[PDB]
C-alpha cells in the first residue's frame, strides 16, 4: 500500500517547498497521478483480499472508496483554488496540506488490518476536517458547526475505543482477518448488548441516522467547499465502511438489536427528504439529501443480506460522487451571488446554459435514473429490504418519489423561471468549474458500463 | 382527454383478456390521434398561437387539407367502418359484449364511445364549421410541403393500415363468429 | 338569490365577494394610502439602486434575509416546551417509530413462524 | 417572398394545390369506404340462432 | 409600461371593470358573434338602467348584487389571450429574454463580431452614465418631505434631461427576443 | 342480454348459471350422445405452436389457415376460403354451446316441473 | 443588527419596533401567536397564493410576483405559483369535495354491483380437448387426468 | 465451441419452404441483397482476422485446484487450516452459483424457443432448476453478508439435527 | 406589396343574422352600434359554410363515382 | 386619461423606447471569420445521398453483422429462435408430413 | 406580419369607423372620445375591448381606462408589440 502512501506524504513537503504560483498546478498534477497509481487496486481476487503486509489490506470495498479518495483530493483543489487566492501563500500552502493529511488519513483508515489502528485515524480525520470548518468557513457559525461535529463524532467513537480494547482483551486481536475467521457468535445478554450499541454507535453517528444526524447540516452549510466534498463524499462513508467491517463480531444480537435504528432510518429517510422539499438552502438541501441516501446504506447495512451489502458499496460510492458534485455546482453559484438562498438566483439556464446541463445531469443522479450507480445500488437495497419485508416497498417507493420531487424542484427553482434582474454579477463560467463538473460526472456514468468494480466483495 | 379515453379503452381489452387487440388499438390510435394532433398544431398555428375553440371557426373552406385530414381522423376514431378505427375499436366493443364481463364496466364503455363521437362532433363543428371567428388579420396558409406530406403519411396510414395489418398478422384470437344483430 | 360561494382556506374569498370591499370608511382609504406610500418609498429605494449604472451585484433585500434567518436561525430561540409544542413533537417524532415498528415487527414475526412451521412457499427465492 | 399576402377581412388566398389534394383524399376514403362495404359485409355470419326443439337437447318429459 | 396603481379604485372604475368582465364572460359563454352582440347589448342596457342611481348606498348595494351574480354567471373556463396572464403563450418567450447587461462580459472575439452595434451601445453607456447624475437630483428636488406617495415618477423637466430611471424600461428585452 | 334479464329480474332457479353449467349430466335425457371427436393430433398442435385457447376442436380449420397463409405470402388474401371455412367451424362450436345452454334452462324448468308436482 | 427577527413582541413599543422593522403598518402587524413554535416576531400574513396577486401589476420579482422590501410570507415558498395554489374557486371547496368523492363511491359501487350481476352470454362454457389440454396446460404426463369427456349435442 | 451437453439444444426442425402463390417473395430478394452486400464482407473480413490469428496461435490454460481438507476436519484457531478450508469454499460457492446460471440459462432459452407451447414443453428445465434452487438455498441461503464456511456447516448441522427430530 | 385594408362601409348588417338580431333589439328598444363591425365575419367567401354532413361527405360524389367505375371493371372483367 | 405630467413622460420613454429598438438593428455587414475542405458544385442531389446512406445503415449493418457473429458463437444462448411453425407439411431434414383426414363435415 | 406603426393607426381608426355612434367624418386620431366625440365611460370600454379584439392582445385596465385617445391606442400597441416604424 506503501505505492500509493508514500508518495501523498511526499505531497506535503513539494505543497511547501513550491513556489506560490505553482502550488495548485504542482499538487493537481501529482495528486492526479497517485489516483492513477490507486487505480491498481481496483484488481481484486474474488476469494481473498489483497493481504499487502500486515498492517495494510484491501479488498474490494476499501479498493473503491480507496480509489474515490485519490479521485477526490484533485477535485477539491480545482474548487478551493478560487476562494482562497486572496489568502496568503503560507495559508494556502496550510490548507493545502490539511486536505493531504486528511487524504492520507482516509487511505490508511480504509487499508488498516487492524480495528484500533482503523479507530485511531478514523479519529484522527477529525483534526483536519474541524480546522478546515472552523478557519476557512465564511460565516460566524462555522465554530458553532464544528464544535457540533466533533463531539457528536467523539461522543459517538469512545464508546466504540472502549468496546474495541474489551475485544482485544476478550478475543486476543483485533485485526479483521483474525476477527472473521474466528468470529464466535454473540449471546443475547445486556452486556454483549452494550457491547454492540458501543461498536454500532459510533458509525451510526458517522453515517448521519435520523435524530443523530443534527450536526451534518450545520457541518455542511458552514463548511467551505473542499470541506464539504471530503465531509459528503468520504467521511459519510467512513461509518458505512466501519459498519460493515464491524459487523462480523455481532452476528445473532443484530437481528434484535436492529429493528429501532432500522424504523429511524426507514422513516428518516421519507422525513428528511420532505425536509429537502421546504428548505431554503441550498446546501442544506444537498445535505438532508445525502441524510437520506445514508439512511438507505444504514438500512442495507443493518439487513445484513449480500444483495444489501452490494448496494450499500454501491451507493456509498455513487452517492458520494453526486454530492460532492452538487455541493459544486451550489458553490459556483454562491461564488457568484454571495448568497445560499435558494430563490435569490432564478433563471440560471438562459445566463449559464453548460452549468445548466451539468446541473439537470446531477439531478438525473440524484433521483437514480437508471442506469446509474445510484439506483443499482438503491435497486439493491430496495430488493434486499422486500426480502427482508414486503412492507418496507411502501416506505422506499415513497422516499423515490419525493427525491424525484427535490431533485426536480431545486432543478426548476436554481435553472428555470426569469432571471433576476437585479443581479448582474453572473459571468461566463470558467473552464475550471466545467472541468470539475466534468471530472465529477464522466467516472460516475463510466462506472455504469462496469459495475462489478463498486458492487463490494460480495459480488 | 381522447387519448385518454383510447388508453383507457385499451384497459379494459385487457381486462376482456384479448391482449393482441389492445395492441392493435394501440397501433391504429397511434396513427390516427398522431394526425389529429398535427392537424391541431396547424390550426394554432395558422391562428397566431390561438387554442380555444371559441375563436376558431369557418375553418372547412379556409383549411381544406387540414379540414380532409381531420374528418378521416374522426371518422377513423369514432369507429367509422373499414377505417383504422373500425379493425380495432369495433372488434373491442364486440369482445367486451361477448364476454364475461362486469355489467357497469360494458355499459361505461358504450357511453365512453358515445361521447367520443359527441367531442369529435364538438371539435368539427366549433372549429371548422360555422363562421369565423379569429381575429381579423387572416394568415391562414397550409401551403407547406412539410406540413402537407407529415398530413399525408398518416392519413393514408390511417385509411389503409388498418386493413392492411389486420389481414396480414397471424390471427391470435378465436373470434366472435356469431353474435345477435343488436 | 344565487347560491353564495363558501371560501375555504384553499379556496379563498374572492375580492369582488368581500364583504369588506364594499363597506369602506375614511379611515380605511387613509390606511390603504399609507400602504401605497410604503410601497411607493421601498419601489424608489429599489428603482434607484437598480438603475445605477455604477452598481455591479446583488440588491440585498432585507426582507429575504429576515425570511431566511426566521425560517432557520430564529426558530430555537424563540421556542418554548410548552404542552402544544411537547405534545406535537412526542406525537410526530416518536408515534410513527412505534407504528412502523408494530407493523414491520408483527410482519416478521409472522413470516418466521410461517418458516419454522415449514409453512412458506421459498420453491425458488435463493437471491436474497 | 409573399406566396399568400394575408387579407384583412376578406377569405384568405387558396391555392389550388390545398383544394385538389384535400379533394382527392377525401374522395379516396369514401372510395375505400364504399369499396370496402360492396366487397365484405361485416353485417353478419350466419344469424344468431335458437335451438326451440326440445327433442333436439332434451324430451324426456317424465 | 404598466401605470402606477392608486390606493383605491373609484366606484366608477370598480363598475367599468365588472362591466368589461361581464362582457367577456358573456363573450365565452356566447360562442356566436350574433348571439353575443344581442347578450351584450341587453348588459349595456342593463348598466344604463341605474346608470343615474344618486343614492350611492343604492349604487354599492347595485354592485354588490351584481358581483355575486357574476360570480355565480362566470364562465368555468373563461377565454383567455394567448399572451395574456393564465393564457397559453404567457410567458412562454420568457427564457428568451436575455438581460442587455449580459453583453458587457462578452469575449472581444464576439464583440468583433458586430462592431458597429456596440459603438451605439457604448454611445448609450455614455448617455444613461452621464444622466444618471441628474435624474438622482431631480428626483430628490421633486419628491415630498415624507418621501414618495406614489409609484409615478416626473417626466423631464428641462431639455438635455432625460426621464429619471429610464434605463430598464426603455432596455427592456424585446418581446419576441427569438 | 334478455337470457341475463331472465336471470336476474325473473326466477334465478330457472335460469342456468354460467359458472355452474352444465350442472345435469350428459347421460339424462339424449339417449345416445357421439364423443365430440378430434380432427387434428395433438402432436399437431404442439408443432404448429397453436396457442392454447386456440387448441380447440376447430384447430385444425386454422392450421390449414396458417399453413394457406405461410405459403400465400406475399399475397395476403388467398386464404379467405379456408378463413371462411374456420369461422364456420368456430360459429358451429358456439352454436352447440348455445343449445348447451337451452338444454340447461329447459332441464331447470322440468326440475322445477317436478317439484310442483310434489305439490 | 436590529434587522433580523427578533422574539414576540408584548408590550405596544415592541409591537411597533417590529411593524416598522418589518416595513408594514402597525395595525396590519399581527405577530403569529405565542405559541412556542418559534415564529416569534415574524408577522402573520395573510394565507394568499402568489397566483391571487395581480398578474399585471409591475412587481420587482414578476416570476415571484413580490416586490422588494415587502414582508415575506413565511410559507410562501409553499405558495409559489409552481406549488400549492388558494386562488377562488368558480364552485365552493366543499361543494367540489362533496360532488368528486361522490362521483368516485357511486363509481366504485356500481362496480361492485356489477360484480354481483356480471353480464355474459347465454352460451355454454368452451370444451376443450384432450382433459382440456391438460397436458398442453402444464399438466404432469406422469399423472393420470381425470378423463374430461365432451359429447356432441 | 460451447459442449452441447452442457447446453442442450432441441434439434431444428425447420419447415421446407413451399409457396402457393406466383408473386415474388420480398423476403428472398432482401436475404439474397442482404448476403451479398454485408454477410460476404464481413465472412471476407473473418477469413482474414482467422488467417492472421493461425499465424499466431498461442495458447491459455484452464487453472486446476487441488483439493483441501475441509472446515470439516479443520481444527479450532487453526487458522492455516481454517484458511484454505474457507478459501475452498468460497470457490465452490462460486461454481453452485455458476451451475445455477447454466440451469437458469437453459431455462430461459427453453421458454423462448418453444413459443406458445412454453407452459408444457420446458416442464423438464422447470424441475431441473427447481432441484437445483432448492438445493441452492438450503446450501447457502439465509447464511448473510458475512458468510463463512463455519457457518454453513452450523446450518449444516442444525437441519441435520432437525431431520433427526423428525425421524424421532 | 404593402397591404391594403379593404374599404369600411362595405360592411353592413344587411342579408346577415346581425340584422335579425338588430330587429330584435329594435323591438325591445335597444340599439347595437358594433354590428358592422362582425360583419365581415359572416360576410364574403366566409357567408356560405357546409352542414356536418356536408363536411362529412367531402368528395363522397367523385369516391362514389370512382367506387361504381372499379365496381363496372370487376364485374366487365369476369 | 392620464395626468399631462403623465402623458409627457409617456411620450419621453416612447420615443427612447423607438429610439432603443431602432438602435438593436444590425448593420448592412455581420463581420465574421474569413475552404476546409473542397466542394466544387459534389451532387447533393444523389452522391451526397448515398453517402449519407452509406455511412449510416451500410456501416452499421457491416459492424453489426459482425458483432453478431462474434457474439453468437463466443456464448451460448446467446441469439434463440422461435422454433418455426412446423405447419403440417414436408420439413427440410425430417421431411415428416400428416394429414388431420379431414374427420369432419365441409358444407358451410 | 411586421405590424407598422402605419398599419396600427389604420385599423385602430377602421374599427372606429365601424362604430356607429361615432360618426365617420368628425373622427380624427386625436379625437378624444369623452370631449370632442360624445362617447361615454362605457363607451371607452367597448371600443378598448373591440381594439384588443382586433389585435388579438389585452389591454390592462388600469392602462385600458387612461387611452382615450386613438392616437394613444396606436401609440400603446406599438410600445407593446415593439413597433419602432
Known amino acids: 500500500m506503501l505505492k500509493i502512501i508514500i508518495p501523498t506524504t511526499m505531497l506535503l513537503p513539494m505543497t511547501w517547498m513550491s513556489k506560490h504560483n505553482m502550488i495548485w498546478i504542482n499538487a493537481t498534477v501529482h495528486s492526479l497521478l497517485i489516483s492513477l497509481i490507486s487505480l491498481s487496486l481496483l484488481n481484486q481476487l474474488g476469494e481473498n483480499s489483497l493481504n499487502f503486509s500486515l498492517t495494510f489490506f484491501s479488498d474490494s470495498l476499501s479498493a473503491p472508496l480507496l480509489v474515490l479518495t485519490t479521485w477526490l483530493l484533485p477535485l477539491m483543489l480545482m474548487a478551493s483554488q478560487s476562494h482562497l487566492s486572496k489568502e496568503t501563500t503560507t495559508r494556502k500552502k496550510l490548507y493545502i496540506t490539511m486536505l493531504i493529511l486528511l487524504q492520507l488519513f482516509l487511505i490508511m483508515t480504509f487499508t488498516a488490518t487492524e480495528l484500533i489502528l482503523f479507530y485511531i485515524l478514523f479519529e484522527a480525520t477529525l483534526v483536519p476536517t474541524l480546522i478546515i470548518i472552523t478557519r476557512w468557513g465564511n460565516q460566524t457559525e462555522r465554530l458553532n458547526a464544528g464544535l457540533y461535529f466533533l463531539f457528536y463524532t467523539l461522543a459517538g467513537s469512545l464508546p466504540l475505543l472502549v468496546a474495541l480494547v474489551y475485544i482485544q482483551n476478550t478475543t486476543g486481536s483485533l485485526n479483521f482477518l483474525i476477527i472473521h475467521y474466528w468470529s464466535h457468535p454473540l449471546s443475547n445478554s445486556w452486556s454483549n448488548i452494550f457491547m454492540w450499541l458501543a461498536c454500532i454507535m459510533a458509525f451510526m453517528v458517522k453515517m448521519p441516522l435520523y435524530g443523530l444526524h443534527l450536526w451534518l447540516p450545520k457541518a455542511h452549510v458552514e463548511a467551505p467547499i473542499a470541506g464539504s466534498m471530503v465531509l459528503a463524499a468520504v467521511l459519510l462513508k467512513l461509518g458505512g465502511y466501519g459498519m460493515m467491517r464491524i459487523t462480523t463480531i455481532l452476528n445473532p444480537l443484530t437481528n434484535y438489536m436492529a429493528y429501532p435504528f432500522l424504523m429511524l432510518s426507514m422513516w428518516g429517510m421519507i422525513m428528511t427528504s420532505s425536509i429537502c422539499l421546504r428548505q431554503?438552502?441550498?446546501?442544506?438541501?444537498?445535505?438532508?439529501?445525502?441524510?437520506?441516501?445514508?439512511?438507505?446504506?444504514?438500512?442495507?447495512?443493518?439487513?445484513?443480506?449480500?444483495?444489501?451489502?452490494?448496494?450499500?458499496?454501491?451507493?456509498?460510492?455513487?452517492?458520494?460522487?453526486?454530492?460532492?458534485?452538487?455541493?459544486?455546482?451550489?458553490?459556483?453559484?454562491?461564488?457568484?451571488?454571495?448568497?445560499?438562498?435558494?430563490?435569490?438566483?432564478?433563471?440560471?439556464?438562459?445566463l449559464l446554459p453548460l452549468m445548466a446541463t451539468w446541473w439537470l445531469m446531477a439531478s438525473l443522479t440524484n433521483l437514480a435514473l437508471p442506469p446509474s450507480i445510484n439506483l443499482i445500488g438503491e435497486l439493491f437495497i430496495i430488493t434486499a429490504s422486500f426480502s427482508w419485508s414486503n412492507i418496507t416497498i411502501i416506505l422506499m417507493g415513497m422516499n423515490m418519489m419525493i427525491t424525484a420531487l427535490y431533485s426536480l424542484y431545486m432543478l426548476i427553482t436554481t435553472q428555470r423561471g426569469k432571471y433576476t434582474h437585479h443581479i448582474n454579477n453572473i459571468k461566463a463560467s470558467f473552464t475550471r468549474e466545467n472541468a470539475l463538473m466534468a471530472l465529477h460526472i464522466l467516472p460516475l456514468l463510466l462506472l455504469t458500463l462496469n459495475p462489478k468494480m463498486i458492487l463490494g466483495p460480495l459480488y | 382527454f381522447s387519448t385518454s379515453s383510447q388508453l383507457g379503452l385499451m384497459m379494459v381489452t385487457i381486462g376482456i383478456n384479448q391482449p393482441h387487440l389492445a395492441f392493435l388499438h394501440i397501433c391504429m390510435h397511434a396513427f390516427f390521434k398522431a394526425m389529429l394532433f398535427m392537424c391541431s398544431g396547424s390550426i394554432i398555428h395558422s391562428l397566431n398561437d390561438e387554442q380555444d375553440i371559441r375563436k376558431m371557426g369557418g375553418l372547412y373552406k379556409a383549411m381544406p387539407f387540414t379540414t380532409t385530414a381531420l374528418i378521416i381522423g374522426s371518422l377513423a376514431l369514432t369507429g367509422m367502418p373499414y377505417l383504422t378505427g373500425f379493425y380495432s375499436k369495433d372488434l373491442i366493443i364486440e369482445a367486451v359484449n361477448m364476454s364475461y364481463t362486469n355489467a357497469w364496466a360494458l355499459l361505461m364503455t358504450l357511453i365512453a364511445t358515445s361521447l367520443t363521437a359527441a367531442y369529435s362532433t364538438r371539435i368539427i363543428f366549433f372549429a371548422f364549421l360555422g363562421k369565423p371567428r379569429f381575429p381579423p388579420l387572416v394568415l391562414i396558409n397550409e401551403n407547406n410541403p412539410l406540413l402537407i406530406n407529415s398530413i399525408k403519411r398518416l392519413l393514408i396510414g390511417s385509411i389503409f393500415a388498418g386493413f392492411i395489418i389486420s389481414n396480414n398478422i397471424p390471427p391470435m384470437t378465436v373470434p366472435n363468429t356469431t353474435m345477435p344483430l343488436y | 338569490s344565487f347560491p353564495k360561494y363558501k371560501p375555504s382556506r384553499l379556496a379563498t374569498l374572492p375580492a369582488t365577494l368581500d364583504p369588506a370591499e364594499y363597506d369602506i370608511s375614511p379611515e380605511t382609504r387613509k390606511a390603504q394610502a399609507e400602504r401605497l406610500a410604503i410601497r411607493s418609498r421601498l419601489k424608489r429605494e429599489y428603482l434607484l439602486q437598480y438603475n445605477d449604472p455604477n452598481r455591479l451585484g446583488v440588491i440585498e433585500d432585507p426582507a429575504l434575509i429576515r425570511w431566511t434567518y426566521a425560517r432557520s436561525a430564529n426558530i430555537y430561540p424563540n421556542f418554548r416546551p410548552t404542552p402544544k409544542t411537547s405534545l406535537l413533537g412526542a406525537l410526530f417524532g416518536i408515534g410513527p417509530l412505534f407504528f412502523w415498528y408494530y407493523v414491520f415487527k408483527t410482519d416478521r414475526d409472522k413470516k418466521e413462524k410461517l418458516i419454522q412451521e415449514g409453512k412458506l412457499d421459498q420453491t425458488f427465492n435463493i437471491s436474497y | 417572398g409573399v406566396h399568400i399576402e394575408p387579407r384583412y377581412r376578406q377569405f384568405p388566398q387558396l391555392t389550388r394545390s390545398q383544394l385538389i389534394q384535400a379533394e382527392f383524399f377525401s374522395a379516396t376514403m369514401w372510395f375505400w369506404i364504399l369499396w370496402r362495404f360492396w366487397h365484405d359485409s361485416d353485417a353478419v355470419l350466419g344469424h344468431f340462432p335458437y335451438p326451440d326443439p326440445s327433442q333436439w337437447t332434451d324430451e324426456e318429459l317424465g | 409600461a404598466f401605470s402606477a396603481p392608486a390606493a383605491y379604485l373609484t366606484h366608477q372604475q370598480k363598475v367599468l371593470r365588472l362591466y368589461k368582465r361581464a362582457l367577456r364572460h358573456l363573450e365565452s359563454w356566447c360562442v356566436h358573434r350574433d348571439k353575443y352582440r344581442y347578450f351584450a347589448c341587453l348588459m349595456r342596457a342593463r348598466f344604463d338602467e341605474h346608470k343615474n342611481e344618486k343614492d350611492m348606498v343604492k349604487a354599492t348595494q347595485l354592485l354588490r348584487q351584481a358581483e355575486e351574480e357574476f360570480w355565480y354567471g362566470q364562465h368555468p373556463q373563461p377565454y383567455i389571450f394567448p399572451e395574456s396572464p393564465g393564457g397559453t403563450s404567457y410567458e412562454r418567450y420568457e427564457c428568451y429574454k436575455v438581460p442587455e447587461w449580459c453583453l458587457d462580459d462578452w469575449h472581444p472575439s464576439e464583440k468583433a463580431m458586430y462592431p458597429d452595434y456596440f459603438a451605439k451601445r457604448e454611445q448609450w453607456k455614455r448617455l444613461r452614465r452621464e444622466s444618471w447624475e441628474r435624474e438622482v437630483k431631480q428626483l430628490q428636488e421633486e419628491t415630498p418631505p415624507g418621501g414618495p406617495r406614489t409609484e409615478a415618477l416626473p417626466p423631464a423637466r428641462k431639455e438635455g434631461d432625460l426621464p429619471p430611471l429610464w434605463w430598464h424600461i426603455v432596455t427592456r428585452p424585446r418581446e419576441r427576443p427569438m | 342480454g334478455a337470457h341475463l334479464a331472465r336471470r336476474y329480474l325473473g326466477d334465478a332457479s330457472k335460469e342456468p348459471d354460467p359458472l355452474r353449467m352444465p350442472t345435469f349430466p350428459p347421460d339424462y335425457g339424449f339417449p345416445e350422445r357421439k364423443e365430440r371427436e378430434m380432427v387434428a393430433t395433438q402432436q399437431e398442435m404442439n408443432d404448429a405452436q397453436l396457442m392454447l385457447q386456440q387448441r380447440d376442436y376447430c384447430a385444425h380449420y386454422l392450421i390449414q389457415l396458417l399453413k394457406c397463409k405461410r405459403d400465400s405470402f406475399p399475397n395476403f388474401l388467398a386464404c379467405k376460403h379456408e378463413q371462411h371455412d374456420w369461422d364456420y367451424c368456430e360459429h358451429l362450436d358456439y352454436v352447440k354451446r348455445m343449445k348447451e345452454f337451452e338444454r340447461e334452462r329447459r332441464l331447470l324448468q322440468r326440475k322445477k316441473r317436478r317439484e310442483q308436482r310434489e305439490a | 443588527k436590529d434587522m433580523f427577527p427578533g422574539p414576540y413582541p408584548k408590550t405596544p413599543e415592541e409591537r411597533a419596533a417590529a411593524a416598522k422593522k418589518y416595513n408594514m403598518r402597525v395595525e396590519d402587524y399581527e405577530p403569529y401567536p405565542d405559541d412556542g413554535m418559534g415564529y416569534g416576531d415574524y408577522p402573520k400574513l395573510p394565507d394568499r397564493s402568489q397566483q391571487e396577486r395581480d398578474p399585471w401589476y409591475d412587481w420587482d420579482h414578476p416570476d415571484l410576483r413580490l416586490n422588494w422590501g415587502e414582508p415575506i410570507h413565511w410559507d410562501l415558498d409553499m405558495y409559489i405559483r409552481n406549488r400549492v395554489d388558494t386562488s377562488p374557486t368558480p364552485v365552493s371547496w366543499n361543494t367540489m369535495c362533496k360532488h368528486l368523492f361522490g362521483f368516485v363511491a357511486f363509481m366504485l359501487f356500481m362496480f361492485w354491483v356489477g360484480e354481483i350481476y356480471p353480464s355474459y352470454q347465454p352460451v355454454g362454457p368452451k370444451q376443450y380437448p384432450y382433459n382440456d389440454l391438460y397436458l398442453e396446460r402444464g399438466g404432469d404426463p406422469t399423472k393420470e387426468p381425470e378423463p374430461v369427456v365432451h359429447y356432441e349435442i | 465451441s460451447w459442449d452441447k451437453d452442457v447446453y442442450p439444444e432441441p434439434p431444428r426442425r425447420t419447415p421446407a419452404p413451399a409457396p402457393q402463390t406466383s408473386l415474388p417473395n420480398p423476403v428472398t430478394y432482401l436475404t439474397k441483397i442482404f448476403d451479398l452486400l454485408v454477410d460476404r464482407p464481413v465472412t471476407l473480413a473473418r477469413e482474414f482476422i482467422e488467417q492472421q490469428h493461425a499465424k499466431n496461435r498461442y495458447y491459455y490454460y484452464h487453472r486446476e485446484f487441488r483439493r483441501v481438507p475441509d472446515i470439516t476436519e479443520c481444527e479450532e484457531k487453526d487458522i492455516l487450516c481454517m484458511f484454505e478450508a474457507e478459501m475452498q469454499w468460497r470457490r465452490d460457492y462460486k461454481v453452485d452459483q455458476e451451475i445455477v446460471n447454466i440451469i437458469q440459462e437453459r431455462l430461459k432459452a427453453c421458454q423462448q424457443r418453444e413459443g406458445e407451447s412454453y407452459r408444457q414443453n420446458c416442464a423438464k428445465e422447470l424441475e431441473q432448476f427447481t432441484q437445483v434452487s432448492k438445493a441452492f438455498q438450503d446450501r447457502y441461503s439465509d447464511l448473510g453478508a458475512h458468510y463463512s464456511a463455519r457457518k454453513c456447516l452450523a446450518k449444516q448441522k442444525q437441519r441435520m439435527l432437525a431431520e433427526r427430530k423428525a425421524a424421532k | 406589396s404593402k397591404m391594403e385594408l379593404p374599404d369600411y362601409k362595405q360592411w353592413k348588417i344587411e342579408g346577415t343574422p346581425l340584422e335579425t338580431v338588430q330587429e330584435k333589439l329594435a323591438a325591445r328598444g335597444l340599439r347595437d352600434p358594433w354590428g358592422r363591425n362582425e360583419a365581415w365575419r359572416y360576410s364574403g367567401g366566409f357567408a356560405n359554410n357546409v352542414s356536418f354532413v356536408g363536411a362529412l361527405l367531402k368528395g363522397f360524389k367523385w369516391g362514389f363515382a370512382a367506387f361504381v367505375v372499379a365496381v363496372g371493371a370487376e364485374y366487365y372483367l369476369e | 386619461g392620464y395626468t399631462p405630467d403623465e402623458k409627457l413622460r409617456l411620450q419621453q420613454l416612447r420615443e427612447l423606447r423607438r429610439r432603443w429598438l431602432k438602435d438593436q438593428e444590425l448593420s448592412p455587414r455581420e463581420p465574421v471569420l474569413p475552404l476546409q475542405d473542397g466542394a466544387p458544385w459534389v451532387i447533393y442531389k444523389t452522391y451526397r445521398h448515398s453517402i449519407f446512406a452509406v455511412t449510416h445503415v451500410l456501416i452499421p449493418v457491416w459492424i453489426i453483422h459482425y458483432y453478431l457473429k462474434y457474439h453468437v458463437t463466443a456464448k451460448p444462448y446467446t441469439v434463440v429462435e422461435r422454433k418455426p411453425r412446423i405447419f403440417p407439411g414436408d420439413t427440410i431434414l425430417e421431411t415428416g408430413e400428416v394429414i388431420p383426414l379431414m374427420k369432419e363435415f365441409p358444407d358451410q | 406580419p411586421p405590424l407598422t406603426l402605419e398599419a396600427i393607426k389604420d385599423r385602430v381608426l377602421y374599427v372606429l369607423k365601424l362604430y356607429d355612434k361615432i360618426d365617420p367624418e368628425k373622427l380624427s386620431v386625436n379625437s378624444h372620445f369623452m370631449k370632442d366625440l360624445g362617447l361615454d365611460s362605457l363607451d371607452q370600454v367597448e371600443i378598448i375591448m373591440a381594439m384588443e379584439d382586433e389585435f388579438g392582445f389585452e389591454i390592462p385596465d388600469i392602462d385600458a381606462e387612461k387611452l382615450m385617445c386613438p392616437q394613444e391606442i396606436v401609440d400603446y400597441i406599438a410600445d407593446k408589440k415593439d413597433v419602432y416604424e
Open chain 1, 280 to 350: 431554503t438552502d441550498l446546501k442544506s438541501l444537498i445535505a438532508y439529501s445525502s441524510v437520506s441516501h445514508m439512511a438507505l446504506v444504514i438500512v442495507a447495512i443493518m439487513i445484513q443480506t449480500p444483495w444489501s451489502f452490494m448496494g450499500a458499496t454501491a451507493l456509498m460510492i455513487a452517492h458520494g460522487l453526486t454530492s460532492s458534485m452538487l455541493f459544486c455546482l451550489a458553490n459556483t453559484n454562491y461564488e457568484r451571488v454571495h448568497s445560499r438562498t435558494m430563490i435569490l438566483a432564478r433563471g440560471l439556464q438562459t
